[PDB]
């Protein structure tokens, strides 16, 4: 967590936690809690950030482009796939229709 | 008087060790 | 311009060297303490005639643990004998880490700088040393001021300098930004050397005593058998062993753990021994009657 007072509460590889000072570099705003951060070893202070959840999980999760599958290349269960589109796709493309009815858009399938 | 002073020096060294913090432990058993 | 500011070649007597070793070893794990008594003359000569270990303090190396009641008292007794020497620094052990001044200890060593202007802090690390030679170094305060004002070059004139690469990060930062390290020499008289050197006359009296003679046969016998078992692998090894490329041969005919070497070693041991055994046996016999 960040406490606005130029201090933070960090966990390292080693088991006890540390009431550390932020010392210069990254501003409190530019930090996000839950991020992986850079500590100087001799005195543990936040000397920056560059890591940003450097972890294989982050690798697997992120996918900025759209998937390899384009639509109804898949053959049959047409009706089925045109049910998943009513709930998901339709509110993101147009919430207008939902507003006009007076009902919350469906969320989730 | 002479004997009492010798107690006073021994007591001060005991005082240094007793000074906080100290490890807390538990005694599994006394063999004796 | 400025003073030489060449750290003392610290001539730590043999008596002081042995004496830090005793106090420091027994006193593990508790970090021990004491003062170094000596004399500072010239610009770079301190001889540490003797040292004495202050009573243990449970607080550890602290400003608390340095104490003038003990300081006064030991020195007053040495007045009576004429062996009195002024405080020229302090030693302590960090045995739980290598030789370098702590952040706490830099404050402490500064108090001693007021007392004596050529004060040393000598860290002796007793558990980690395996011989009482390695991981022992000497130090002397270099101000915070020096670091800012770029006065460190003045400080390393007329010296060769000693770097301890091992142990870094923090520790090393502190070390570089606090003290200056210089070589440590051991001085002894040759009357001392002769004492160190000495043994006894019962040393050689023992060397004329003879073992039971059956046991000696046992060893001669054993060696012969010993060498049979390794002579087969040696026999096997040299059957061909002509094949091109040395590196391959080392795996194939087992040139590692060399049987030729191992045979010559056993033969030679047993041999020097059996020349001493026949010699001693004859000498005693003719001498006595």
Domain ranges of chain C: 7-186, 212-289
Which pair of tokens denotes residue C182?
């210089």
Q: CA angle, C271 as apex, C268 and C272 as ends, to 5°?
A: 90
Whether C250 has its CB under 8 Å from any CB of chain A: the answer is no
Which pair of tokens denotes residue C152?
């460190």
Which pair of tokens denotes residue C87?
């405080």
Which helix (H) or strand (E) segment is A84 a member of?
helix A78-84
What crossing angle do the helices spanning C259-288 and C214-237 adopt, rounded to 10°? 160
Interface with chain C: mutation pick from B8, B9, B14, B16, highest number of C CBs within 10 Å: B16
Resolution (A): 7.8
The DSSP code for A88 is I
Q: Quick one: residue B23, left, alpha or beta (phi over 0 = left, psi -120 to 50 = alpha)?
A: beta
- Across the beta sheet with A2-3, the strand order is A2-3, A7-11, A17-22, A45-48, A38-39
d(CA C163, CA C156): 12
Pairing, β C9-12 against β C184-185: parallel
- Across the beta sheet with C9-12, the strand order is C136-139, C120-124, C87-93, C33-41, C45-52, C9-12, C184-185
CA distance readout (Å), C257 to C231, C248, C260, C262, C266: 13, 15, 9, 8, 14
Which helix (H) or strand (E) segment is A3 a member of?
strand A2-3
| Residue carrying structure tokens 């700088």 | C113
d(CA C254, CA C212): 40
With a CB cutoff of 8 Å and minimum separation 6, the contacts of C110 are C141
Is C92 part of any known ligand binding site?
yes
155-214 in C: which are within 8 Å (CB) of A? 169-171, 173-174
List the subunits that have 3+ CB pairs under 8 angstroms with B. Answer: C
Pairing, β C136-139 against β C45-52: unpaired
Whose CA is closest to C83, among C39, C30, C20? Answer: C39
d(CA C235, CA C277): 31
Spell C4-36 as b/e; 16+ CB within 10 A means b.
Answer: ebbbbbbbbbeebbebbeebbbebeeebbbbbb
Three-state DSSP state, B20: coil
Burial class (CB in 10 A: 0-12, 13-18, 19+), C52: middle
**Rg of chain A over all Cα atoms, to the nearest angstrom:** 23
Which pair of tokens denotes residue C167?
């142990």
3-state SS of chain C is CCCCCCCCEEEECHHHHHHHHHHHHHCCCCCCEEEEEEEEECCCEEEEEEEECCCCCCCCCCCCCCCHHHHHHHHHHHHHHCCCCCEEEEEEECCCCCCCCCHHHHHHHHHHHHHCCCCEEEEECCCCCCCCCCCEEEECECCHHHHHHCCHHHHCCCCCCCCCCCCCHHHHHHHHCCECCCCEECCCCHHHHHHHHCCCCHHHHCCCCCCCCHHHHHHHHHHHHHHHHHHHHHHHHCCCCCCCCHHHHHHHCCCCCCHHHHHHHHHHHHHHHHHHHHHHHHHHHHHHC
Cβ atoms within 10 Å of C74's Cβ, excluding its own? 14
d(CA C208, CA C83): 45
Which residues, in sequence order, are bridge partners of residue C146?
none
Which pair of tokens denotes residue C89?
């620094």
Report yes or no on chains C and A touching (3+ CB pairs under 8 A): yes
d(CA C289, CA C280): 15
Burial class (CB in 10 A: 0-12, 13-18, 19+), C62: middle
d(CA C280, CA C287): 11
Give the determination technique: cryo-EM
A–C interface: beta-carbon pairs under 8 A: 8
CA distance readout (Å), C160 to C8, C43, C63, C145, C156: 12, 16, 32, 23, 8
Which pair of tokens denotes residue C218?
């046992």
- The answer to whether C98 and C163 have CB atoms below 8 angstroms apart is no
Which pair of tokens denotes residue C65?
């643990």
Q: CA angle, C24 as apex, C21 and C26 as ends, to 5°?
A: 100
d(CA C117, CA C120): 9
Rounded to 5 degrees, what are φ and ψ at A21?
-105, 150
45-64 in C: which are within 8 Å (CB) of B? 55-59
- The answer to whether C125 and C136 have CB atoms below 8 angstroms apart is yes
């Amino acid at each position: 967590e960040i406490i606005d007072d130029d201090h933070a509460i960090v966990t390292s590889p080693t088991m006890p936690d540390y009431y550390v000072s932020i010392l210069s570099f990254v501003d409190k705003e530019l930090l996000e809690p839950g991020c992986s951060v850079l500590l100087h070893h001799k005195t543990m202070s936040i000397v920056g950030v560059l890591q940003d959840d450097a972890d294989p999980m982050v690798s697997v999760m992120k996918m900025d482009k759209s998937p390899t599958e384009s639509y109804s290349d898949i053959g049959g269960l047409e009706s089925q796939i045109q049910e998943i589109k009513e709930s998901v796709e339709l509110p993101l493309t147009h919430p207008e229709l939902y507003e006009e009815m007076g009902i919350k858009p469906p969320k989730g399938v | 008087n002479v004997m009492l002073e010798k107690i006073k020096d021994n007591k001060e060294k005991i005082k240094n060790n007793r000074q906080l913090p100290y490890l807390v432990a538990n005694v599994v058993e006394v063999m004796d | 311009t400025g003073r030489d500011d060449t750290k003392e070649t610290v001539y730590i007597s043999s008596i002081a060297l042995l004496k830090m070793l005793k106090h420091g070893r027994a006193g593990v794990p508790m970090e021990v303490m004491g003062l170094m008594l000596g004399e500072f003359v010239d610009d770079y000569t301190v001889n540490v005639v003797d040292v004495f270990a202050m009573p243990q303090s449970g607080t550890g190396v602290s400003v608390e643990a340095v104490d003038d009641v003990f300081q006064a008292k030991m020195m007053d007794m040495l007045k009576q004998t004429g062996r009195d020497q002024m405080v020229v620094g302090w030693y302590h052990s960090h045995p739980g880490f290598g030789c370098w001044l702590s952040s706490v200890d830099v404050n402490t060593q500064k108090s001693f700088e007021q007392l004596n202007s050529r004060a040393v802090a000598v860290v002796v690390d007793p558990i980690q040393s395996v011989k009482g030679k390695v991981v022992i170094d000497a130090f002397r305060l270099i101000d915070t001021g020096a670091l800012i004002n770029n006065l460190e070059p003045r400080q390393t004139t007329s010296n060769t300098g000693l770097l301890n690469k091992a142990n870094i990060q923090a520790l090393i930062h502190g070390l570089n930004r606090h003290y200056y390290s210089l070589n440590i020499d051991y001085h002894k008289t040759a009357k001392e050397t002769k004492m160190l050197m000495n043994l006894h006359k019962e040393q050689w009296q023992s060397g004329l005593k003879m073992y039971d003679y059956e046991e000696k046969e046992e060893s001669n016998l054993a060696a012969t058998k010993s060498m049979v078992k390794i002579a087969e692998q040696y026999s096997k090894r040299i059957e061909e062993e002509k094949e091109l490329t040395e590196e391959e041969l080392k795996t194939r005919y087992v040139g590692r753990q060399d049987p030729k070497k191992h045979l010559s070693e056993t033969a030679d041991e047993t041999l020097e021994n059996n020349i001493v055994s026949v010699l001693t046996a004859g000498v005693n016999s003719v001498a006595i009657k």
